[PDB]
Design a protein around this ligand. Structure first.
Ligand SMILES: Nc1ncnc2c1ncn2[C@@H]1O[C@H](COP(=O)(O)O)[C@@H](O)[C@H]1O
Ligand SMILES: Nc1ncnc2c1ncn2[C@@H]1O[C@H](COP(=O)(O)O)[C@@H](O)[C@H]1O
Ligand SMILES: Nc1ncnc2c1ncn2[C@@H]1O[C@H](COP(=O)(O)O)[C@@H](O)[C@H]1O
Lengths: 304, 102, 73
């Protein structure tokens, strides 16, 4: 349906509008040891940090949980071959070790640029963290995420000039991923999950029983818990054992059916503050994933 | 990151604190003006970026034995360009501290 | 042509001013699970394992960001 109540809203609002009144921002100098950087993420309760290159006098990139996972996986394999470098690596040296010729410059956005431009930048760059950087100051103000954006959209858009597509199902809109779902089992070692994250470039893994029914969820976010330990040697534990550390409490995994409306799914995701739902059949067998990446890509091209 | 301290503390003589910070400022090629005996306004040209950044230094007494040097940034007046006023304020502070203290 | 005399208050600046224009020496921040204008002032953690952590809160229009820089010494 529609041009879009959504597309219009996004084009008429500045990135500034989604910034909270107060926030914190952790920045790492690129000469910081990698092990110290990751502990600092845990310590500060933060999932991403801009990288400042002191020689160049500029931000050059981000360090996120994805990078922690790439490093941990490399560390685990290298240790088996008695190569123990990475953990005394500084951020600089790890970045040089991967981003060799393969250019990945820092992607950012002005506080005065549109929300539509922000969403498009997240999708196009296949990224989850978009620093809002004031061109006048050069100051990073805030790190924009899919979660924040969908919440803002849900809150500030009236319900009842309502697009026809909102009452259509995930099935008919074809929103989500429905093949080659990367999953683990209860007993799957952490190091195996890490290799899966590294190969598939996916933000969470459903945990399934012998019958392929979802019983838990191992997010990349559940992985930085490991940075709190001084040892790192406990990567042979099961994913189930690793998730005992998931502080809070756990109801079930948050799921949906293929035949629920886009509206119902957006509402569920925003209330839960979670990056994806697991798409499941009548019997809890996993059929796919519907991520905030999927939803925002749809809303930016109009539902579909 | 539990306990945050405002600037840095010293039990050195305040006369020695100011003398040394002025020495470090001169050594780093920053410009400065003395507002009060315990209050300096400093300005630095960034070598890489060519921009100017300003901050204030203020010495306070906190005990009968203890002084506190307070640093405050002064406000001015798709891939990023070089520069961040906030990060540069941090570097200015760290540079001044390194080259005058302990 | 008499010699002239100088009267020197001497000690308006005997010692550095006493602290509070309510500037708090210490801010204690616990992740459990405003303060008017400590804006633009430098804060730091104790140096641990050869890393400085410098912090300050700055304003952009009506929004406030507290930036922490982790930097080796
Ligand atoms: N805004 C950004 N600009 C450049 N690179 C980024 C940005 N955000 C994340 N990355 C990098 O892209 C990869 C995927 O990150 P993430 O989106 O956090 O899963 C990681 O290696 C990040 O370091
Ligand atoms: N575990 C997974 N297996 C397969 N595809 C996934 C998985 N998680 C997310 N996706 C898809 O990968 C894309 C990026 O999702 P995300 O990594 O959640 O931002 C979206 O199209 C998701 O539907
Ligand atoms: N569909 C879901 N059901 C239950 N918990 C989830 C789900 N998705 C993420 N989580 C948990 O919520 C936290 C945030 O993960 P993320 O949504 O990846 O930011 C992590 O502890 C996840 O394990």
């Amino acid at each position: 349906s529609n041009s879009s109540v959504y597309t219009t809203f996004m084009k008429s609002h500045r990135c500034y509008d989604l910034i909270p009144t107060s926030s914190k921002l952790v920045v790492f100098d690129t000469s910081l040891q990698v092990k110290k950087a990751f502990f600092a993420l845990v310590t500060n309760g933060v999932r991403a940090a801009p990288l400042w290159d002191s020689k160049k006098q500029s931000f050059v990139g981000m360090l996120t949980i994805t990078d922690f996972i790439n490093i941990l996986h490399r560390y685990y394999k290298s240790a088996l071959v008695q190569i123990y470098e990475l953990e005394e690596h500084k951020i600089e040296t790890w970045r040089e070790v991967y981003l060799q010729d393969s250019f990945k410059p820092l992607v950012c956005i002005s506080p005065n640029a549109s929300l539509f431009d922000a969403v498009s930048s997240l999708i196009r760059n296949k990224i989850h963290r978009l620093p809002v950087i004031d061109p006048e100051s050069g100051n990073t103000l805030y790190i924009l995420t899919h979660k924040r954006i969908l919440k803002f959209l849900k809150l500030f858009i009236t319900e009842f000039p309502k697009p026809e597509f909102m009452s259509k199902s995930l099935e008919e809109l074809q929103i989500g991923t429905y093949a080659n779902i990367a999953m683990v089992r209860t007993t799957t070692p952490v190091y195996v999950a890490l290799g899966i994250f590294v190969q598939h470039r996916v933000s969470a893994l459903p945990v399934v029983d012998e019958k392929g029914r979802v019983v838990d969820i191992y997010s990349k976010f559940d992985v930085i818990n490991l940075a709190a330990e001084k040892t790192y040697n406990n990567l042979d534990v099961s994913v189930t054992k690793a998730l005992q550390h998931r502080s809070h409490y756990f109801e079930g995994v948050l799921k949906c059916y293929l035949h629920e409306t886009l509206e119902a799914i957006i509402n569920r995701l925003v209330e839960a503050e979670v990056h994806r739902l697991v798409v499941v059949d009548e019997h809890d067998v996993v059929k796919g994933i519907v991520s905030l990446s999927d939803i925002l890509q749809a809303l930016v091209l109009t539902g579909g | 990151s539990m306990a945050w301290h405002l600037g840095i503390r010293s039990q050195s003589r305040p006369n020695d604190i100011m003398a040394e910070v002025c020495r470090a400022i001169k050594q780093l090629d920053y410009e400065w003006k003395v507002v009060n005996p315990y209050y300096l306004r400093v300005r630095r040209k960034n070598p890489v970026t060519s921009t100017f950044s300003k901050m204030s230094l203020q010495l306070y007494q906190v005990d009968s034995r203890t002084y506190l040097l307070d640093f405050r940034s002064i406000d001015d007046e798709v891939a990023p360009r070089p520069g961040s006023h906030t990060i540069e304020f941090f570097e200015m502070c760290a540079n001044l501290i390194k080259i005058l203290a302990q | 042509g008499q010699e002239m005399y100088a009267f020197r208050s001497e000690e308006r600046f005997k010692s550095p001013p006493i602290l509070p224009p309510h500037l708090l020496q210490v801010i204690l921040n616990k992740d459990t699970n405003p303060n008017h204008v400590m804006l633009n002032h430098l804060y730091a953690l104790s140096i641990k394992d050869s890393v400085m952590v410098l912090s300050a809160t700055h304003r952009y229009k009506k929004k406030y960001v507290t930036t922490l820089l982790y930097k080796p010494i």
